[PDB]
Amino acid sequence: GSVQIVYKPVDLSKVTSKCGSLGNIHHKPGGGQVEVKSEKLDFKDRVQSKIGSLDNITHVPGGGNKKIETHKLTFR
Amino acid sequence: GSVQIVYKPVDLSKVTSKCGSLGNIHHKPGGGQVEVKSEKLDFKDRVQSKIGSLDNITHVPGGGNKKIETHKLTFR
Amino acid sequence: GSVQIVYKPVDLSKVTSKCGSLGNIHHKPGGGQVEVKSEKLDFKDRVQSKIGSLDNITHVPGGGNKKIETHKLTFR
Amino acid sequence: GSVQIVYKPVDLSKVTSKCGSLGNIHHKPGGGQVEVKSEKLDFKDRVQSKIGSLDNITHVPGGGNKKIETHKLTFR
Amino acid sequence: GSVQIVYKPVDLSKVTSKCGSLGNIHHKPGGGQVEVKSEKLDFKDRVQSKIGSLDNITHVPGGGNKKIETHKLTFR
Amino acid sequence: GSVQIVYKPVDLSKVTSKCGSLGNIHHKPGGGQVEVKSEKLDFKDRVQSKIGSLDNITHVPGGGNKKIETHKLTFR
Prior knowledge:
Chains A, B, C, D, E, F: It is found in: Cytoplasm, Cytosol; Cell membrane; Cytoplasm, Cytoskeleton; Cell projection, Axon. The structure is a homohexamer. By secondary structure, chain A is mostly beta strands.
């Protein structure tokens, strides 16, 4: 029972961007209000919980190009 | 029972962008109000919960080109 | 029962960005208010909890290009 | 030319109120937004101007009974 | 030319209030935003101007009964 | 030309209030934002100007009964 596997993914990929000018980007959040109320909590596995946030984010990258990959080979 | 596998994905892909000028991007959220009320919670697996957020996001990348891949080979 | 595996992923990938000028990026959050109320908590595994945050973030990288990979080979 | 004036206003007035209980009066304004734009202004007499307000008022008097009078006698 | 004036206003007035209990009066304004823009202003007499306010008022008097009067006699 | 004036205003006025209990009065303003912009100002008489306020007031008197009067007699 011969088994011969050749896993050979080739990639030649360029992810490019050209932006002449970034500027004059304002962000002025005018306040807010949040109220939460509970009694009990029982988190048991891999929970990623947020309770009552008032976040503000200004994210201005001059690039920002993402390239995600995932290779998963399994044998049994 | 001979088994011979050739996994050979080739890629030559370019993801490009050209933006002459980014500017004059305003963002002025005028407040808000949130109220939540509960009693009990029992999260058990891989939960990704948000309860009562008042988020604001300004996301101005000069690029922003995404390229996602996923290769998954399985044998039994 | 001969088993022969060749795991050989080749990559030639460039992730590039060109931004002429970054500037004049303002961020003026105007306050806020958060209130949370609970009784008990029992976190049991890999919890990543946030309760009652008032975050502000200004994230202005001149690059910001991400490239994530993940290789996972398993044999049994 | 005899002139005889008798100005004699009599008043016996009671302004009464009885409130058994005041309570549980909530007021939760959820934000807003106002924008005004002009060039010139020339106010010349007894002006009482408001331009661009975002007021909130909670006025809970336990009494609140008003009694206004005005007497004006003139001779020439 | 005899002139005889009798200005004699009599007042017996009671302004009363009875409140059994004041309580549980909440006030939670959730933010806001105001923007005004002008060039010139020329105020000349008795002006009472407000430009761009974001007021909040909680006014809870246990009494609050007002009684205003005004007497004005003039002769020529 | 005899002139005889009798200015005799009598007042017996009581302004009363009875409040059994004041309490549990909350006030939680959740932020805000104000922006004003002008060039010139020329105020000339009795001006009472406010420009760009973000006031908050909690005014809880146990009494609060006002009684204003004004007497003005003039002769020529």
